[PDB]
Amino acid sequence: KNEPVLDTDGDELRAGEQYYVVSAIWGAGGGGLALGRLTDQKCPEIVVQRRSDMDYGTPVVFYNLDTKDDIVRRSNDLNIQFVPIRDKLCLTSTVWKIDDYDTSTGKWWVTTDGVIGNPGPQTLQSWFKIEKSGTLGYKFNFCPSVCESCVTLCNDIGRYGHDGQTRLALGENGWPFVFKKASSTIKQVVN
Ligand SMILES: [Zn+2]
Ligand SMILES: [Zn+2]
Ligand SMILES: [Zn+2]
Ligand SMILES: [Zn+2]
Ligand SMILES: [Zn+2]
Ligand SMILES: [Zn+2]
Ligand SMILES: [Zn+2]
Ligand SMILES: [Zn+2]
Ligand SMILES: [Zn+2]
Ligand SMILES: [Zn+2]
């Protein structure tokens, strides 16, 4: 099938397991991804990047389009869901989703309140791909294939500042990330 995505230990990513998503570029490239809030629309929570490269953020879990495939592979539509350790600030879902166009900034933001499964027109905004980013990590790509007769955006995901926070949005140059096992996943390779 398609080539598996690898984590920072060299292990193939497993669907249903927790991974931190951490910038492959540290320093001013920042740390990991997490749920954030906008003052003007506190729910759903938005996707933000921690500024500290020592802060891995909140892990995500990946859900394959083909639920029978245990491995997360490049160029395959999947759903992405934050699994917060903390209490719920919002009752919307923590599944990533592309927002409606933001006229005040010109951006298509990554936000949450996405849906898991049910591939097709209704869930089009909830399907992401992971692609290789040259020789350094992986980039997220919004280019869903789940609806043949749907017109869709087809763009890499970059990072962009907004209102003092680092957000993710569609762009020309995708930002590179690596995947680090969370503690729950480390248990899956040890007896
Ligand atoms: Zn292929
Ligand atoms: Zn190995
Ligand atoms: Zn392996
Ligand atoms: Zn922090
Ligand atoms: Zn299969
Ligand atoms: Zn919205
Ligand atoms: Zn706006
Ligand atoms: Zn603004
Ligand atoms: Zn704003
Ligand atoms: Zn186990």
PDB file of C-alpha atoms and ligand atoms in Angstrom:
ATOM      1  CA  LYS A   1       0.000   0.000   0.000  1.00  0.00           C
ATOM      2  CA  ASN A   2       1.201   3.568   0.507  1.00  0.00           C
ATOM      3  CA  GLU A   3       4.379   4.125   2.489  1.00  0.00           C
ATOM      4  CA  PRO A   4       3.895   4.186   6.285  1.00  0.00           C
ATOM      5  CA  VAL A   5       4.511   7.372   8.229  1.00  0.00           C
ATOM      6  CA  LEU A   6       7.260   6.890  10.823  1.00  0.00           C
ATOM      7  CA  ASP A   7       7.576   8.379  14.292  1.00  0.00           C
ATOM      8  CA  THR A   8      10.794   9.735  15.795  1.00  0.00           C
ATOM      9  CA  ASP A   9      11.777   6.218  16.922  1.00  0.00           C
ATOM     10  CA  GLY A  10      11.541   4.922  13.352  1.00  0.00           C
ATOM     11  CA  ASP A  11       8.354   2.950  14.085  1.00  0.00           C
ATOM     12  CA  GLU A  12       5.374   2.981  11.747  1.00  0.00           C
ATOM     13  CA  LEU A  13       2.499   5.085  13.023  1.00  0.00           C
ATOM     14  CA  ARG A  14      -0.476   3.096  14.318  1.00  0.00           C
ATOM     15  CA  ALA A  15      -4.054   4.274  13.903  1.00  0.00           C
ATOM     16  CA  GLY A  16      -5.757   4.761  17.251  1.00  0.00           C
ATOM     17  CA  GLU A  17      -2.529   5.514  19.162  1.00  0.00           C
ATOM     18  CA  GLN A  18      -1.465   8.818  20.704  1.00  0.00           C
ATOM     19  CA  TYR A  19       1.294  10.948  19.173  1.00  0.00           C
ATOM     20  CA  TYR A  20       2.568  14.423  19.865  1.00  0.00           C
ATOM     21  CA  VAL A  21       2.854  16.488  16.696  1.00  0.00           C
ATOM     22  CA  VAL A  22       6.047  18.518  17.120  1.00  0.00           C
ATOM     23  CA  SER A  23       7.634  20.976  14.707  1.00  0.00           C
ATOM     24  CA  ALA A  24      10.581  19.414  12.860  1.00  0.00           C
ATOM     25  CA  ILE A  25      12.219  22.848  13.169  1.00  0.00           C
ATOM     26  CA  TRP A  26      12.908  23.922  16.726  1.00  0.00           C
ATOM     27  CA  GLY A  27      13.923  27.293  18.149  1.00  0.00           C
ATOM     28  CA  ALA A  28      11.803  29.909  16.396  1.00  0.00           C
ATOM     29  CA  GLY A  29      10.105  26.974  14.670  1.00  0.00           C
ATOM     30  CA  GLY A  30       8.275  26.314  17.948  1.00  0.00           C
ATOM     31  CA  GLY A  31       6.991  23.208  19.658  1.00  0.00           C
ATOM     32  CA  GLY A  32       3.973  20.922  19.446  1.00  0.00           C
ATOM     33  CA  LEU A  33       0.316  21.383  18.542  1.00  0.00           C
ATOM     34  CA  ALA A  34      -2.511  21.919  21.026  1.00  0.00           C
ATOM     35  CA  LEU A  35      -6.051  23.168  21.460  1.00  0.00           C
ATOM     36  CA  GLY A  36      -6.340  26.937  21.752  1.00  0.00           C
ATOM     37  CA  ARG A  37      -9.082  29.510  22.167  1.00  0.00           C
ATOM     38  CA  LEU A  38     -10.049  32.679  20.352  1.00  0.00           C
ATOM     39  CA  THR A  39     -11.698  35.372  22.447  1.00  0.00           C
ATOM     40  CA  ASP A  40     -14.233  36.118  19.690  1.00  0.00           C
ATOM     41  CA  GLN A  41     -15.325  32.462  19.308  1.00  0.00           C
ATOM     42  CA  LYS A  42     -14.224  30.410  22.315  1.00  0.00           C
ATOM     43  CA  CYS A  43     -15.897  27.241  20.988  1.00  0.00           C
ATOM     44  CA  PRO A  44     -14.944  25.220  19.054  1.00  0.00           C
ATOM     45  CA  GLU A  45     -11.328  25.294  20.123  1.00  0.00           C
ATOM     46  CA  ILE A  46      -8.820  26.088  17.421  1.00  0.00           C
ATOM     47  CA  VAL A  47      -5.548  24.351  16.565  1.00  0.00           C
ATOM     48  CA  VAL A  48      -2.483  26.251  17.777  1.00  0.00           C
ATOM     49  CA  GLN A  49       1.242  25.622  18.053  1.00  0.00           C
ATOM     50  CA  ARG A  50       3.100  26.042  21.320  1.00  0.00           C
ATOM     51  CA  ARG A  51       5.832  28.651  20.985  1.00  0.00           C
ATOM     52  CA  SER A  52       8.198  26.708  23.248  1.00  0.00           C
ATOM     53  CA  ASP A  53      10.035  23.908  21.462  1.00  0.00           C
ATOM     54  CA  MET A  54      10.108  22.147  24.861  1.00  0.00           C
ATOM     55  CA  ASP A  55       6.282  22.005  24.916  1.00  0.00           C
ATOM     56  CA  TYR A  56       5.017  19.079  22.864  1.00  0.00           C
ATOM     57  CA  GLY A  57       1.402  20.217  23.276  1.00  0.00           C
ATOM     58  CA  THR A  58      -1.479  17.738  23.332  1.00  0.00           C
ATOM     59  CA  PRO A  59      -1.344  14.343  21.583  1.00  0.00           C
ATOM     60  CA  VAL A  60      -3.518  13.439  18.633  1.00  0.00           C
ATOM     61  CA  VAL A  61      -4.920  10.148  17.439  1.00  0.00           C
ATOM     62  CA  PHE A  62      -5.274   9.286  13.746  1.00  0.00           C
ATOM     63  CA  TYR A  63      -8.285   7.500  12.235  1.00  0.00           C
ATOM     64  CA  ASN A  64      -7.821   5.886   8.840  1.00  0.00           C
ATOM     65  CA  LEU A  65     -10.340   6.116   6.034  1.00  0.00           C
ATOM     66  CA  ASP A  66     -10.104   2.336   5.759  1.00  0.00           C
ATOM     67  CA  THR A  67     -10.758   1.380   9.385  1.00  0.00           C
ATOM     68  CA  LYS A  68      -9.235  -2.064   8.757  1.00  0.00           C
ATOM     69  CA  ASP A  69      -5.767  -0.593   8.088  1.00  0.00           C
ATOM     70  CA  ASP A  70      -3.775  -0.504  11.344  1.00  0.00           C
ATOM     71  CA  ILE A  71      -0.968   1.662   9.892  1.00  0.00           C
ATOM     72  CA  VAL A  72      -1.009   5.403   9.167  1.00  0.00           C
ATOM     73  CA  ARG A  73       0.407   5.896   5.669  1.00  0.00           C
ATOM     74  CA  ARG A  74       1.391   8.871   3.527  1.00  0.00           C
ATOM     75  CA  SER A  75      -1.106  10.374   1.077  1.00  0.00           C
ATOM     76  CA  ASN A  76      -4.126   8.643   2.702  1.00  0.00           C
ATOM     77  CA  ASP A  77      -7.178  10.591   3.889  1.00  0.00           C
ATOM     78  CA  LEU A  78      -7.556  10.364   7.662  1.00  0.00           C
ATOM     79  CA  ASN A  79      -9.178  12.125  10.596  1.00  0.00           C
ATOM     80  CA  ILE A  80      -7.079  13.819  13.278  1.00  0.00           C
ATOM     81  CA  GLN A  81      -8.333  14.210  16.847  1.00  0.00           C
ATOM     82  CA  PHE A  82      -6.743  15.819  19.895  1.00  0.00           C
ATOM     83  CA  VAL A  83      -6.925  13.692  23.038  1.00  0.00           C
ATOM     84  CA  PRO A  84      -6.632  16.266  25.847  1.00  0.00           C
ATOM     85  CA  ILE A  85      -5.504  15.199  29.294  1.00  0.00           C
ATOM     86  CA  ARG A  86      -7.365  18.227  30.677  1.00  0.00           C
ATOM     87  CA  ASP A  87     -11.070  18.876  31.206  1.00  0.00           C
ATOM     88  CA  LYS A  88     -13.315  19.865  28.305  1.00  0.00           C
ATOM     89  CA  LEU A  89     -13.624  23.640  27.874  1.00  0.00           C
ATOM     90  CA  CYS A  90     -15.892  23.052  24.892  1.00  0.00           C
ATOM     91  CA  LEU A  91     -18.446  20.382  24.076  1.00  0.00           C
ATOM     92  CA  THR A  92     -17.599  20.572  20.373  1.00  0.00           C
ATOM     93  CA  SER A  93     -15.374  17.799  19.083  1.00  0.00           C
ATOM     94  CA  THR A  94     -11.588  17.950  19.137  1.00  0.00           C
ATOM     95  CA  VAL A  95     -11.416  16.577  15.571  1.00  0.00           C
ATOM     96  CA  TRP A  96      -9.540  18.798  13.120  1.00  0.00           C
ATOM     97  CA  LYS A  97     -11.575  20.487  10.381  1.00  0.00           C
ATOM     98  CA  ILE A  98     -10.968  23.167   7.761  1.00  0.00           C
ATOM     99  CA  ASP A  99     -12.939  26.313   8.631  1.00  0.00           C
ATOM    100  CA  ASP A 100     -15.003  28.499   6.357  1.00  0.00           C
ATOM    101  CA  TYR A 101     -12.993  31.230   4.619  1.00  0.00           C
ATOM    102  CA  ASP A 102     -12.047  34.039   7.036  1.00  0.00           C
ATOM    103  CA  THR A 103     -12.565  37.299   5.166  1.00  0.00           C
ATOM    104  CA  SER A 104     -10.830  39.334   7.877  1.00  0.00           C
ATOM    105  CA  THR A 105      -7.484  37.551   7.318  1.00  0.00           C
ATOM    106  CA  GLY A 106      -7.698  35.782   3.952  1.00  0.00           C
ATOM    107  CA  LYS A 107      -7.045  32.422   5.636  1.00  0.00           C
ATOM    108  CA  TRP A 108      -8.616  28.961   5.668  1.00  0.00           C
ATOM    109  CA  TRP A 109      -7.877  28.024   9.287  1.00  0.00           C
ATOM    110  CA  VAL A 110      -7.572  24.583  10.824  1.00  0.00           C
ATOM    111  CA  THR A 111     -10.132  24.476  13.623  1.00  0.00           C
ATOM    112  CA  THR A 112     -11.976  21.680  15.429  1.00  0.00           C
ATOM    113  CA  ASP A 113     -15.567  20.337  15.719  1.00  0.00           C
ATOM    114  CA  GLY A 114     -14.746  17.948  12.886  1.00  0.00           C
ATOM    115  CA  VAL A 115     -16.316  14.518  12.452  1.00  0.00           C
ATOM    116  CA  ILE A 116     -14.787  11.028  12.488  1.00  0.00           C
ATOM    117  CA  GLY A 117     -15.643   8.652   9.659  1.00  0.00           C
ATOM    118  CA  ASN A 118     -18.613   8.759   7.299  1.00  0.00           C
ATOM    119  CA  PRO A 119     -16.429   9.723   4.305  1.00  0.00           C
ATOM    120  CA  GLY A 120     -18.292  11.751   1.728  1.00  0.00           C
ATOM    121  CA  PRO A 121     -19.569  15.265   1.057  1.00  0.00           C
ATOM    122  CA  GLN A 122     -20.893  15.853   4.573  1.00  0.00           C
ATOM    123  CA  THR A 123     -17.523  15.247   6.257  1.00  0.00           C
ATOM    124  CA  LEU A 124     -15.255  16.631   3.497  1.00  0.00           C
ATOM    125  CA  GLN A 125     -13.671  19.269   5.740  1.00  0.00           C
ATOM    126  CA  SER A 126     -12.484  16.639   8.294  1.00  0.00           C
ATOM    127  CA  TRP A 127     -10.134  14.639   6.021  1.00  0.00           C
ATOM    128  CA  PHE A 128      -6.384  15.327   6.019  1.00  0.00           C
ATOM    129  CA  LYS A 129      -3.317  13.677   4.534  1.00  0.00           C
ATOM    130  CA  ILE A 130       0.213  13.329   5.837  1.00  0.00           C
ATOM    131  CA  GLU A 131       2.922  13.864   3.231  1.00  0.00           C
ATOM    132  CA  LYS A 132       6.682  13.628   3.284  1.00  0.00           C
ATOM    133  CA  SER A 133       8.355  17.029   3.632  1.00  0.00           C
ATOM    134  CA  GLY A 134      11.663  16.604   1.828  1.00  0.00           C
ATOM    135  CA  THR A 135      14.408  15.270   4.083  1.00  0.00           C
ATOM    136  CA  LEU A 136      12.934  16.696   7.317  1.00  0.00           C
ATOM    137  CA  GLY A 137       9.659  15.399   8.697  1.00  0.00           C
ATOM    138  CA  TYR A 138       6.106  15.429   7.419  1.00  0.00           C
ATOM    139  CA  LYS A 139       3.563  18.045   6.435  1.00  0.00           C
ATOM    140  CA  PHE A 140      -0.194  18.039   6.652  1.00  0.00           C
ATOM    141  CA  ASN A 141      -2.060  18.311   3.373  1.00  0.00           C
ATOM    142  CA  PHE A 142      -5.736  19.144   2.940  1.00  0.00           C
ATOM    143  CA  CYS A 143      -6.709  17.534  -0.338  1.00  0.00           C
ATOM    144  CA  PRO A 144      -9.534  15.059   0.324  1.00  0.00           C
ATOM    145  CA  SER A 145     -10.402  12.290  -2.142  1.00  0.00           C
ATOM    146  CA  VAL A 146     -13.462  10.984  -0.281  1.00  0.00           C
ATOM    147  CA  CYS A 147     -16.001  12.643  -2.652  1.00  0.00           C
ATOM    148  CA  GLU A 148     -15.211  12.211  -6.363  1.00  0.00           C
ATOM    149  CA  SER A 149     -17.850  14.717  -7.442  1.00  0.00           C
ATOM    150  CA  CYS A 150     -16.898  17.417  -4.907  1.00  0.00           C
ATOM    151  CA  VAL A 151     -14.847  20.485  -5.682  1.00  0.00           C
ATOM    152  CA  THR A 152     -12.258  20.834  -2.927  1.00  0.00           C
ATOM    153  CA  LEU A 153      -9.344  22.920  -1.841  1.00  0.00           C
ATOM    154  CA  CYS A 154      -6.036  21.081  -2.225  1.00  0.00           C
ATOM    155  CA  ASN A 155      -3.263  22.730  -0.219  1.00  0.00           C
ATOM    156  CA  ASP A 156      -0.549  22.079   2.313  1.00  0.00           C
ATOM    157  CA  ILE A 157      -0.969  23.339   5.866  1.00  0.00           C
ATOM    158  CA  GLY A 158       1.371  26.045   7.133  1.00  0.00           C
ATOM    159  CA  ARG A 159       1.686  28.040  10.326  1.00  0.00           C
ATOM    160  CA  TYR A 160       0.566  31.656  10.598  1.00  0.00           C
ATOM    161  CA  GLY A 161       0.367  34.181  13.406  1.00  0.00           C
ATOM    162  CA  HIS A 162      -3.007  35.593  14.399  1.00  0.00           C
ATOM    163  CA  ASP A 163      -3.976  37.634  17.472  1.00  0.00           C
ATOM    164  CA  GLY A 164      -0.807  36.643  19.311  1.00  0.00           C
ATOM    165  CA  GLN A 165      -1.141  32.902  18.633  1.00  0.00           C
ATOM    166  CA  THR A 166       0.422  30.566  16.089  1.00  0.00           C
ATOM    167  CA  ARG A 167      -2.374  28.952  14.082  1.00  0.00           C
ATOM    168  CA  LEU A 168      -2.451  26.470  11.218  1.00  0.00           C
ATOM    169  CA  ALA A 169      -3.968  27.364   7.860  1.00  0.00           C
ATOM    170  CA  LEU A 170      -3.867  26.327   4.244  1.00  0.00           C
ATOM    171  CA  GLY A 171      -0.867  27.763   2.448  1.00  0.00           C
ATOM    172  CA  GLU A 172       1.717  27.291  -0.251  1.00  0.00           C
ATOM    173  CA  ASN A 173       4.562  25.919   1.907  1.00  0.00           C
ATOM    174  CA  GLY A 174       3.616  23.237   4.410  1.00  0.00           C
ATOM    175  CA  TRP A 175       5.210  23.363   7.823  1.00  0.00           C
ATOM    176  CA  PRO A 176       7.198  20.223   8.752  1.00  0.00           C
ATOM    177  CA  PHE A 177       6.404  18.109  11.797  1.00  0.00           C
ATOM    178  CA  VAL A 178       7.601  14.912  13.428  1.00  0.00           C
ATOM    179  CA  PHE A 179       5.535  12.447  15.447  1.00  0.00           C
ATOM    180  CA  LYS A 180       6.567  11.441  18.952  1.00  0.00           C
ATOM    181  CA  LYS A 181       4.934   8.591  20.863  1.00  0.00           C
ATOM    182  CA  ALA A 182       2.900   9.656  23.853  1.00  0.00           C
ATOM    183  CA  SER A 183       3.241   7.565  27.007  1.00  0.00           C
ATOM    184  CA  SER A 184       0.205   5.437  26.092  1.00  0.00           C
ATOM    185  CA  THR A 185       1.859   4.408  22.807  1.00  0.00           C
ATOM    186  CA  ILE A 186       5.260   3.676  24.346  1.00  0.00           C
ATOM    187  CA  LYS A 187       3.469   0.906  26.268  1.00  0.00           C
ATOM    188  CA  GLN A 188       2.619  -0.804  22.949  1.00  0.00           C
ATOM    189  CA  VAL A 189       6.258  -1.654  22.143  1.00  0.00           C
ATOM    190  CA  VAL A 190       7.268  -2.896  25.615  1.00  0.00           C
ATOM    191  CA  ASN A 191       6.342  -6.139  27.379  1.00  0.00           C
TER     192      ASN A 191
HETATM  193 ZN    ZN B   1       0.048   5.614  -3.302  1.00  0.00          ZN
HETATM  194 ZN    ZN B   2      12.991  -0.412  14.509  1.00  0.00          ZN
HETATM  195 ZN    ZN B   3       8.621  -1.044  12.052  1.00  0.00          ZN
HETATM  196 ZN    ZN B   4       3.687  25.390  27.752  1.00  0.00          ZN
HETATM  197 ZN    ZN B   5      -8.033  -2.742   4.047  1.00  0.00          ZN
HETATM  198 ZN    ZN B   6     -16.197  28.045  11.616  1.00  0.00          ZN
HETATM  199 ZN    ZN B   7     -12.418  37.019  10.734  1.00  0.00          ZN
HETATM  200 ZN    ZN B   8      -6.771  40.047  12.627  1.00  0.00          ZN
HETATM  201 ZN    ZN B   9      -9.144  36.833  15.558  1.00  0.00          ZN
HETATM  202 ZN    ZN B  10      -1.137  -2.241  24.977  1.00  0.00          ZN
END
